[PDB]
Design a protein around this nucleic acid. Structure first.
Ligand SMILES: Nc1ncnc2c1ncn2[C@@H]1O[C@H](COP(=O)(O)OP(=O)(O)O)[C@@H](O)[C@H]1O
Ligand SMILES: [Mg+2]
Ligand SMILES: [Mg+2]
Ligand SMILES: [Mg+2]
Ligand SMILES: [Mg+2]
Lengths: 228, 186, 319, 320, 319, 305, 228
DNA sequence: GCAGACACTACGAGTACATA
DNA sequence: TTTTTATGTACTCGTAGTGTCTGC
């Protein structure tokens, strides 16, 4: 089995979520962070033909730039990972699953409390600004029949008192009202257009981005507030 | 210097408002002022038999033992915590000293030797070229005056004075008076 | 009268005082804080304990609350030089638009690796002194560089006068009582409340934290009093057998504490110190110190402990 | 059964690690204070410390979480440096569990010295995030936990039972060992050896099970294993007699015999002479043996050091 | 049967035992190792002597060999905390792809400055207990922190029963004999082989190292036997210089016998006993016993011997 | 005879080159020949404790005879990071002429190094195939027990009455030869026989002496000894840290040098005082202080002639 | 005498092999380590005009990047040195040869048991794989007729068993068997094409790296194994 | 396309603690 | 009124140097 540029750019992403990863045969791959805060699922171009656990993902992906863009890969007789090149050949330590915090399966997403969508054009401007504005967290609430988004500076701010930023997403059809806060840090998604799925059963509560490539879930913040 | 009316903005205000950090830094470096300790109110209490009770303040078994190490009236007690004290609570090592070393006074000056900085560099040198430890090295220098004429050999070795090596000898620009000093009169 | 936060279960943080009066402090200290909140402007201040939970970081937030400051609260260990250049310079230079004293609370700023940040701060404090002031909180002063103590009013905690201690304790008892009414905790014997206060005196946090753990049964009765005044491990059986100079008993206790020696030997020093005469102290350190020193050469550790006991039995003249 | 078995482990003091607070063998007041805690449904900041190893500190930490059904991150203390607290733990502590679970961070074996910097950083953290999540610290030595973190916690101190607890805890541990043997295929010929293993290393329940593995080589525990567990491999008569008689050539000859294993011999001698000599000879005999034992291992010729002990006792002992 | 490594000339390392059976050990110890290799999985173990060359680090490699583990062997002193974090964590987390027990042998781990690494290891051992186990080898236990002894089966060496000693010695004699056949060493007197074994008993390394040095001449005859059992000489020059109470001579003899002290001190007790009056005997044990006792704290051993001579010279009344 | 002509100090430019040129006990020389014969060198310890018996000379010679690739190292320079770094390099690297590799660690006695020595115990077994170690020590107890286990311990100093008479002749011939080379005029052969006899066991000092005669080409402890006589303290208190550096040697010199300078029942007192101090060194935590305490004790109780 | 842009770079490079150096008159430099592990020779086009010894090399090349490039480095008027500049003059110490370890042995590599080449871009790939794949020893040998390299991990894989890396270097035609092992530590060349000449008889031996800008020769580790 | 600018690493400074 | 041992190990900070990759 081989992997292409597009695939890897993903896993270099999935690295920033969990420095390890467990993956098996299929065109599906996934990781969730050790601490229970985020998670991503992926359908991909290239095809997996055997189960394997990688301890150091962020650097395996690295080793992979150290040979041609085509070298074939497989499970060695040596039950490790064989990256074989035209001239050379590498043998990457496949780790014991015990130690790679992976998700057993895939949990469905509660038919969403609230729905709206976000242009990738739009989301680039959020990240873009946030560096510029020291925006460390955000909140998505309802201002006048439309779904807005507000960036803050939890550092200087403390209470999320003053808004430093405010995109304006969709409109709000239904009639609840809420404030879902999100740790910017917890937002690890390769840019591109998303459908947004919010959810809460009181103290329960999460947020799902639905890409064209993969789906992402991040935890709300401790006092995300709402009437669901 | 235009405008010609500025209630002078203090060295700091300019550093910051203008936001070049390298000037802000040297303004920082301004007060480095390094000194600390107050370990002599601890020594003092052990001596004068006032009350401190320790616990709150940092304590140095090395520093308290050495300070007292001065006055022979104490040596018996320090001698004790020296053999035995390794392995006692700082709370303890202190409580003991309170109840042993009896009188009280001491005046300041410790005894530190006088280093001829040059003589040390010379022995440190000889022990280097000759892979001997310091006592033979001293023998060599005694010997090497009285014949075989120390200039002969200091001239050969002036070769390695490497300024990493000087940092091992003294700690200041006294250290640069020495680079020159054996580069010279041999 | 009592502020409750209600977003916290942890209960020494539920009852964290909102204002400078709700705080239990030495007389002169409370008065100096009232004085400050009166003048309406807040100078650069350092609050330090070194005994934890005396209320430093609580009074920090209260001072701000009373003068109605615009306050940024900051973890000390998070406040590195780039933070001061960055976020703090912004805040300190920006103008609060209600005309509020701006105040930066740096909590637990006594870490060693921040000395570089602290120096950088010494120039800052003079540049921005017109806008905003800084309140530093520290457990150990020597971790605050000297030129920052020069620039501040250093207020020093939990070291009350003999009278303050007696008043502060009454005040803390009244407060605990009030916390009990609110919490549904039944007080059967007031003596146990006076005991919890006295036990952990300087530290008001642990004194409340205790109340949570002895409330398992919703009541404080004479039976809880036994556990509050009582000593759960202790040394008593050895200390007593030592005084009595008996041996079969000492011979028997040896194997018990041989289990973990380094700890036991420690307690014994600490506990005998109080119970024996002045030149018995000097002898007891020589005896215990020597014994501790060779432990780990000595092959049978249980015997080595017996040897220590026989030694102390004979030579200890007990007050 | 009444017992959790992990089955992913062969190592067997880790196979039988207790799942819940009840399966744990603890002092009465301690178990009760933990039930009390799991009852109120929320977990405060806690420190568990022995200093004796294997009292169950890091086991009870995981159980507490299990009982309250917390979302728990478990962390090696020595891995928890200040950048960890800033990065992953701050993330976890700020994130909201979605199933309204107490979040808990278990820092195991946090008493290392070079982490003081991390610990201080944690002191301001614990108050900021106290609403979401609590911290359970496990330590062998308290003094390695800075004072302001002890202020912030309920410090529970282990392996320090009452005299009654000790007697009950020992019975409980004997019943448990018995049960582990049924499961393991270990035949118990003499129950006295199981009571001996427990008593031998009491505070430490880990070593007490670890022992069982090593004395099970032969799949049975019989009176013969009991000799190695208590093990005395000792009859002292020839020395005791040569001592009374105050003769020396004999003492001089017996020295090399018992120099072989000293720490045991010295032990029997104390035990056996105690009964055979007068009351103020007892106090002298501890001073003489104690001192001799103390310097053994500095003393270069061990056989001579034994001879020196005999001469000393021969003269100063007055035999009842 | 005997394993020979053949890449080594040094000959106490040529004959290093490959498997648990080739090892000469106490009965119960061998049996407990067989038991272990049987169950096929290896627990966390500590092997300690403190007498060198009892086979600790040999049996470590052999245990691995018998269970066919994937084993990383590591110098203890090289085993600092960043090593455990980096390479060992890698190895312990990686899965061996033949389904082999993974085992990390840390040899000679009893150094003092590694306590920090050992603590770090205490949490590691429980995390990775499923994959892999650790075998620690130490000369002095007190250099292994208590919580690591808790986590291990501590097996203690070179402390056989009286019967084991008698069997082990026979086994070691057979082995030496076999090594001689292989090496081209002629055995003229079997009594010298039994002597070498008995001489340094616990230590099998030195016992083979000796054989190299007495083989200069490719034969072991009655003449070598004299040097093996032989001498250290009589003591006459000292015993005489002692009676005469002269010093310069005593001062000069010190360095001579400083060479091997434990033997000398032994002869001195044995020989003086006969040559001095009855209450000089009791004094001579107190003087020699005390001197022997501190040797090894005493820094300059030649001086310590002089000190012994001066003491005896004065207090000995001679017959 | 053997000359290294570029060497400006007498002891460095005359050192016997080979095992035969060395003056030794019979059995000792024969055991060294035996060794050089087998062509490979085991791990060895050479120790006196009497200085100048030839330990560090025989070390270089053994290497010379077997034609080893040898790294020579000052003991006090060989700390754990040296063994990890350069020595591990050398011991793992293969000499490319097929030479025994050998590491000579000279004067390895001080237990400042115990940590290094332990580190070495595992090392010696790991690279025992390439290369061996020769340790030189004045005092054995400064060499940890497990290193003595791994070595052949060869001990100096018990010459027979005949050896003494021959060795002295040999040393006189040698000194004579050194004099020819050095341009030193011998007017009276009796003085040469005197230097040899005067410090006999110690061949180093016996050559070092000859240099002292050097200024006309024909034939220390003071600062402490003085401060002791004067019974002053601030000076004694100051000298302590100087000699705390290597204690076992200093204490040795102090015994040797005071013996001559003090009254007869002051000698008996001085051994009781120094002996007891030496005895507890190494329990005593602060070694500089322990030296101070020795000074105070001697100042008061010593009666100088 | 004057020292160029290319000469000085074989001088920072010979510092990685010896603290000190002794080059003498000629157009030849060479140095080898105080532990006789590593030998490096190089023929420069700046002609050294006298015999000098420096206790420290990497110290000297420092006082030389400052001075402009006239740098008539002459010999001081008292045995030390003179760095002549466009507009200044500097004085470096000059060590008595008794204080520098100099090779003194321009011994000639006997004859090659076998010869083979390596492409510089492929030194690249190995000098870098080993960094993050954690290699510290390699072994040059014959697999399937060509001469390969194996990287291993002396610590993790105590006896050169699991190969973390292989590289193929163009066939061997001679009929011999061998396994030459080198401790990566004692390998210090700046990249480039290199002729590889490896010699050994019986047990004594070494490997010689011919390069167009320098020559390198190091020692097989303890266990290397062949039949020449 | 290349600068710009970002993200990462290596190093030196100061602190610390256990041993001797 | 006085003032810091030597070796080895571990950890945090700031900064400078190093390298890979993208917007106008
Ligand atoms: N056996 C010997 N024969 C000749 N010279 C000797 C002998 N032993 C020592 N020396 C002299 O001592 C010097 C070297 O001393 P060294 O071997 O270091 O003595 P030590 O090991 O006792 O310190 C040389 O200069 C040498 O002349
Ligand atoms: Mg606080
Ligand atoms: Mg644990
Ligand atoms: Mg070993
Ligand atoms: Mg020497």
């Amino acid at each position: 089995m081989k992997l292409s540029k597009d695939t890897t750019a993903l896993l270099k992403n999935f690295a920033t979520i969990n420095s390890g990863i467990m993956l098996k045969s299929g065109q599906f791959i996934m990781t969730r962070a050790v601490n229970g805060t985020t998670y991503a699922e992926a359908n991909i171009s290239d095809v997996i033909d055997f189960d394997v656990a990688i301890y150091d993902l962020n650097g395996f992906l690295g080793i992979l730039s150290l040979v041609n863009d085509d070298a074939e890969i497989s499970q060695s007789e040596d039950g490790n990972i064989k990256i074989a090149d035209a001239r050379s050949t590498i043998f990457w330590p496949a780790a014991d699953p015990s130690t790679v915090v992976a998700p057993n399966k895939p949990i469905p997403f509660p038919v969403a409390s609230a729905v709206t969508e976000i242009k990738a054009e739009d989301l680039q401007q959020l990240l873009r600004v946030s560096r510029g504005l020291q925006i460390d967290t955000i909140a998505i609430t309802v201002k006048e029949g439309k779904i807005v988004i507000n960036g803050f500076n939890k550092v200087e701010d403390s209470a999320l008192t003053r808004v430093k930023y405010s995109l304006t997403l969709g409109d709000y059809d239904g009639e609840n009202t809420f404030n879902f806060i999100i740790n910017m840090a917890n937002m690890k998604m390769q840019p591109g257009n998303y459908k947004l799925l919010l959810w809460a059963k009181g103290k329960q509560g999460a947020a799902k981005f639905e890409g064209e490539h993969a789906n992402y879930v991040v935890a709300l913040e401790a006092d995300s507030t709402h009437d669901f | 210097s235009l405008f010609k009316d500025d209630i002078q903005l203090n060295e700091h205000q300019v550093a910051w408002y203008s936001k070049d950090w390298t000037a802000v830094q040297s303004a920082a470096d301004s007060f480095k002022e390094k000194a600390e300790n107050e370990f002599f109110e601890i020594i003092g209490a052990i001596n004068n038999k006032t009350k401190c009770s320790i616990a709150q303040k940092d304590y140095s078994k090395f520093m308290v033992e050495n300070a007292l190490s001065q006055f022979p009236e104490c040596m018996p007690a320090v001698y004790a915590m020296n053999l035995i004290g390794s392995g006692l609570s700082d709370e303890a090592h202190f409580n003991y000293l309170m109840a042993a070393v009896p009188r009280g006074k001491r005046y300041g000056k410790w005894a530190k030797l006088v280093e001829d900085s040059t003589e040390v560099l010379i022995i440190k040198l000889l022990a280097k070229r000759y892979q001997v430890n310091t006592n033979d090295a001293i023998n060599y220098k005694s010997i090497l005056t009285k014949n075989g004429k120390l200039p002969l050999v200091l001239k050969e070795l002036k070769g390695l004075v490497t300024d990493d090596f000087l940092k091992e000898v003294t700690k200041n620009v006294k250290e640069q008076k020495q680079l020159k000093k054996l580069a010279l009169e041999w | 009268m009592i502020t409750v936060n209600e977003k916290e279960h942890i209960l020494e943080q539920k009852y964290r005082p909102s204002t400078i009066d709700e705080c239990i402090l030495p007389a002169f200290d409370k008065e100096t804080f009232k004085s400050i909140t009166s003048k309406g402007k807040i100078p650069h201040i350092i609050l330090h304990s070194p005994s934890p939970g005396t209320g430093k970081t609580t009074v920090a937030k209260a001072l701000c609350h009373d003068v109605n400051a615009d306050m940024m609260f900051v973890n000390g260990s998070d406040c590195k030089i780039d933070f001061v250049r960055g976020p703090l310079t912004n805040f300190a230079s920006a103008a609060s638009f209600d005309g509020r004293q701006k105040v930066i609370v740096i909590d637990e700023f006594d870490r060693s690796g921040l000395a570089e940040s602290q120096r950088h701060l010494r120039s800052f404090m003079e540049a921005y002194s017109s806008n905003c002031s800084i309140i530093i909180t520290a457990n150990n002063i020597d971790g605050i560089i000297k030129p920052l103590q020069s620039r501040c009013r250093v207020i020093t905690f939990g070291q009350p006068t003999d009278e303050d201690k007696i008043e502060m304790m009454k005040q803390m008892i009244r407060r605990l009582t009030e916390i009990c009414k609110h919490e549904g905790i039944a007080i059967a014997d007031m003596k146990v409340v006076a005991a919890l206060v006295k036990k952990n005196f300087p530290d008001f946090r642990k004194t409340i934290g205790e109340l949570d753990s002895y409330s398992s049964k919703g009541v404080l009765d004479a039976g809880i009093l036994s556990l509050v005044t009582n000593d759960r491990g202790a040394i008593d059986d050895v200390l007593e057998s030592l005084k009595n100079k008996d041996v079969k008993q000492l011979r028997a206790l040896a194997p018990k504490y041989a289990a973990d020696y380094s700890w036991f030997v420690g307690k014994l020093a600490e506990e005998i110190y109080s119970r024996v005469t002045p030149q018995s102290i000097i002898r007891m350190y020589e005896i215990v110190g020597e014994n501790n020193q060779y432990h780990g050469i000595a092959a049978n550790t249980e015997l080595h402990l017996a040897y220590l006991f026989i030694q102390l039995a004979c030579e200890m003249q007990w007050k």
